[PDB]
Design an enzyme around this catalytic site. Structure first.
Site, short mmCIF file in Angstrom:
data_model
loop_
_atom_site.label_atom_id
_atom_site.label_comp_id
_atom_site.label_asym_id
_atom_site.label_seq_id
_atom_site.Cartn_x
_atom_site.Cartn_y
_atom_site.Cartn_z
N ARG A 168 0.53 -1.31 -0.18
CA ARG A 168 0.38 0.20 0.38
C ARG A 168 0.59 1.42 0.20
NH1 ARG A 168 -1.84 -0.92 4.72
NH2 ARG A 168 -1.55 -2.92 4.28
N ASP A 180 9.23 -0.52 11.20
CA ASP A 180 7.96 0.52 10.19
C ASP A 180 7.18 1.37 11.87
OD1 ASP A 180 6.80 -2.02 10.45
OD2 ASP A 180 5.24 -1.26 9.19
N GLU A 238 -7.04 -12.30 18.37
CA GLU A 238 -6.98 -11.63 17.22
C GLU A 238 -8.21 -10.43 17.31
OE1 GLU A 238 -3.48 -13.00 16.51
OE2 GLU A 238 -4.23 -10.79 16.36
N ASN A 277 2.25 1.59 7.46
CA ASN A 277 2.00 0.93 5.86
C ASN A 277 1.71 1.69 4.63
OD1 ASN A 277 1.60 -1.24 7.70
ND2 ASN A 277 -0.58 -0.55 8.16
#
Lengths: 445, 445, 445
Positions: free
Chosen positions: A15, A102, A151, A222
């Site tokens: 992305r 990141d 999750e 991202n």
């Protein structure tokens, strides 16, 4: 004590729509992943293990850093799998902290709390409670006790109310860590790193948790919109640190530091200034609107007028430069020198109280003190390149071309529109003088 | 199906303090009312009816748009009265949507929901619930059923709690609409468009409502402060769309697009860049701080250095331009060409790997490959205008005046400070050479 | 009635890290303390008493203002002690209002409410309720009645809930004030000004309170970060006032006014413009991005292109200047004149419809109407300085040096690359013409 870090940086930054590996993308002009390395270095990290999938070659290329321990990876098949690949690399006597390439803004304090809240033979885990936790991993506690991560995926409506979430950053002893790892399954198809939480409460160990002081410390990139938000956060921070340390910024939201700024006292920086590389500013310096400074030393009391660009340049005290001036590497101004509008300086020194006021180009020049460089003067120094030299008290008329190598001794004067190919002697006048020719009553086209 | 729109734009923009009709005032460099037209076009609007009071002539002037159906109006006497003036213009088989020329940000999605929630033989009505509804029209429901609108004016203390308000945007069949209209009174003295809501529940029809996704979609402009807020909203939106589509903006809050930007991959745009008209940028282009680009094509891998202005200009791949460069219409750079500081280019082409580094003006020029344009070179091309031509491998000394029409063939060299009136032959050197004249021990004034 | 003010400005601005007295630090380019004086002047303040500790000399220096009554102070030992030092200076028949030199944003309305809510023989006290009051003086009321102030220091857990706090600004009759003052103790070691609240309810007087309309009105500056926040607040305010009064700002958050802007109707100012001193803009003027204007008059319909700097300059109607233009004091453009890129103007007038398009310097020049100043023209006017004069319809070729004093009469034409030392006659052509010299097949180094 002993401590190493692992930086996860293997996913596909799809992305980002980029041909450049996500983590190499710059924040304040330096790779996201270098911020993380930098921080690791500041911890005392004895070794840094970097786990990557694709982008390998130009990753280790664009990151010289021969000090690093690189770790290849089949092809992104498990964030836990990744952590397995570096597992055989952890000494049993050292702590191993886990970071992501990141997430550039993670502060040392937050990590140097994580490393203190680690329970012997256990995990120190970084967490954050969210306004809207509507898609992340829940921290599942029983009596406020961490037992395992859920999750967002498989999360009961009841669990989905758990504000507190997993940053994915955590600690553990290298020995214990090697253990908990290669005892996990693949029955998404992948291996979740999440599991080693329950697989730690399993064998009766305690998993503690500290929080970062700012949400931005655990913000992941991202895409570029996300990166730009972090850029702004990072710049606001730097700006506020300079304000609190005594630098006046006329608008800290229109200020950018991409490197380091050493400064003295009572400096003013107006709007839309960018600082790159390492810039040293003395006391009482003024930088006007729109200036870009890269790797420069500016002496006490100098004034940089609006829209002036400087790179690898030096000004002594009391100099003035701009507006609309361009100083290139090697440009040097002696005390009280002045450079004006539409003037470019390359590998040249302009001596004490010398002036180059308008429309001039000076390269590969040694110019003395008290020199007047008239408007439109050009060092015609390209044919490698050759040296022009001018002594003290020289007057150079406007629109003179100095054809190097040429030397103009002290006290010499040069008439306007003169081409200079030969040397000029002390106090000698030189006038390239022709004869203007006259037609009467001329009909202009 | 069939659908037309009506744009109301007849009031007095008194609080704009302007001699220009309010709706013509630009948002991102284009008339508020054109944003609304644009949107209408995107709906498939078969016809667009524009209702105006004063400002008529230069309205239809400043808006060429020969496709539009203009509708005059006595002198603003009723927003409903206005809607009457276009009433005889609605085909009975088509839907008629109502918009306002001073609400530029209304999205298609919000209208292309309005047109779906329209009940056969009824009204689709756009609404928004407000934080503070302290002066607008209340949506008055009974069992959550829309029955009519109450002006803040005549509103009981109980009604004033009705958060939900009237945007003034709505739909209805052209037939039904013609009906509901000319059955209304004038007993403020005017006719309220509000009424056709109750005058629709009157004859037992259902009035549905959708909401806009953003409050800004229904923000009206009465003054410039309001318009500036919408400008910022619009620019933030554009900036975020470019970030998400892969363009890096070093500060998206100091970025402005007034037109269209086509782009390739891995482009970086630094602070305070403005993009006007239609700009095409290739892969890996870098635009430095302060640049303004208007109607330009920039080839792969080119670098535009800070404070460079370009309009109707073209760069092939690998070019470099700036800082402080000015390219005017017709300016063209061939592959790997360089233009430096204080250089202006007009209707000129600088061929493959050619350089114009400093203090030069080039207009009406055809320059070949591998050419060196020394500092201070001027095409003296004005006396209409005449053509200067320079072949490959030419060296042009500094402060040369090229007096067009003149041709300098390949491999020629031109000494510094030369005036060129006559053509120059292949590999010929030309030096406009005089004799510098010397006075010893000259006393400078 | 009668009223005087006292400005407290004696503390050590240690956290400013400055060699300049805190209160002299500028907000929108003017000393914090002058904003306060200005406001006092607007009240009708008959006298202004300024209390200072250190920084004395250059305080009264950097503030000419011979109208002020200065008050020395031992060495900051009590904010109340300070108020004692000016006490013998208050006439018994006049009100005395108390302000702080480091609270620049206090509005007149808020003070001209304070002066109305003052109870005869009592105190008017400014207050604000805080989101988080976690360190200030609490306003302690009994039945909503002000009885005295509690320092955050000695404040019960119960008191610490008192949102409302002391701004430190208040009123009182000069007589009554002289009273309440020198009846206070030193048993921090200092004397608190706080006390005169209870020492007023003591002798049965009523202390009323009004609130400022904005929190920023009572924001104090202790450091530069704080000052920068106030700068932004102040600039947003100015910008919004110009927007509401009819000036279009393309981005009001990238606009700065440091002085006064008189304006006519339908003006557009693009991003990153700074306005200093006093600027007068006529109707329909356009200022492009990045321009700095200081003490300028710009006539109706003029266009200032991006990155143009002007100081003490005048443009008549229909002029165009820029981009990349530099106008210095004395620069004057007659109606419809044009100045282009990389052009500097000093003490020069460019007459009706005259053009100076590129790469020129014009100083100490009187230029007439319809004149064409070719690219690269320089007034070589420095040897004091001498005058160049050019009549109407003159054509000046590119790269001409005009060596002043010189006069070029009407209709004259000057060939390119000409040096002009002697006067030129009506309609006479002059060409400084040499002979270009030719070498065949020359091998370029």
């Amino acid at each position: 004590s002993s401590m190493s870090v692992v930086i996860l940086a293997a996913g596909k930054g799809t992305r980002m729509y980029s041909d450049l590996p996500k983590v190499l993308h710059p924040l304040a002009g330096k790779p996201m992943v270098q911020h993380v390395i930098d921080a690791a270095m500041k911890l005392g990290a004895q070794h840094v293990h970097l786990v990557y999938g694709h982008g390998g070659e130009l990753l280790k290329k664009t990151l010289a850093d021969p000090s690093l321990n690189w770790v290849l990876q089949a092809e992104q098949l498990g964030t836990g799998h990744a952590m397995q690949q570096a597992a055989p690399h952890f000494a049993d006597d050292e702590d191993i902290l886990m970071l992501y390439g990141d997430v550039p803004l993670i502060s040392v304090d937050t990590l140097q709390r994580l490393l203190a809240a680690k329970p012997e033979g256990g995990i120190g885990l970084l967490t954050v409670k969210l306004d809207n936790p509507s898609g992340y991993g829940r921290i599942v506690r029983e009596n406020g006790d961490v037992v395992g991560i859920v999750e967002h995926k498989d999360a009961s409506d009841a669990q989905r109310e758990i504000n507190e979430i997993n940053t994915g950053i955590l600690v553990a002893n290298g020995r214990d860590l090697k253990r908990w790892l290669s005892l996990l399954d693949n029955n998404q198809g992948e291996f979740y790193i999440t599991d080693i939480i329950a697989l730690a409460h399993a064998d009766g160990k305690k998993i503690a948790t500290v929080h970062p002081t700012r949400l931005s410390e655990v913000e992941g990139v991202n895409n570029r919109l996300q990166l730009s938000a972090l850029e702004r956060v990072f710049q606001t921070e730097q700006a506020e640190k300079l304000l609190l340390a005594g630098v006046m910024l006329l608008d800290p939201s229109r200020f950018d530091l991409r490197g380091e700024l050493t400064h003295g006292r009572d400096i003013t920086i107006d709007t839309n200034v960018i600082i790159e590389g390492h810039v040293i500013l003395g006391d009482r310096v003024r930088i006007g609107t729109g200036c870009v400074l890269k790797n420069c030393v500016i002496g006490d009391d100098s004034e940089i007028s609006p829209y002036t660009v400087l790179e690898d340049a030096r000004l002594d005290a009391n100099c003035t430069v701009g507006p609309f001036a361009r100083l290139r590497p090697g440009a040097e101004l002696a005390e009280g020198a002045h450079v004006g509008n539409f003037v470019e300086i390359k590998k040249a020194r302009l001596g004490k109280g010398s002036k180059a006021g308008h429309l001039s180009y000076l390269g590969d020049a040694e110019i003395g003190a008290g020199v007047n460089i008239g408007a439109g003067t050009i060092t015609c120094n390209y044919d490698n390149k050759f040296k022009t030299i001018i002594g003290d008290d020289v007057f150079v008329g406007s629109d003179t071309q100095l054809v190097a190598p040429v030397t103009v001794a002290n006290g010499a004067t040069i008439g306007a529109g003169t081409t200079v190919t030969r040397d000029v002697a002390e106090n000698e006048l030189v006038i390239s003088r022709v004869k203007q020719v006259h037609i009467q009553g001329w009909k202009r086209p």
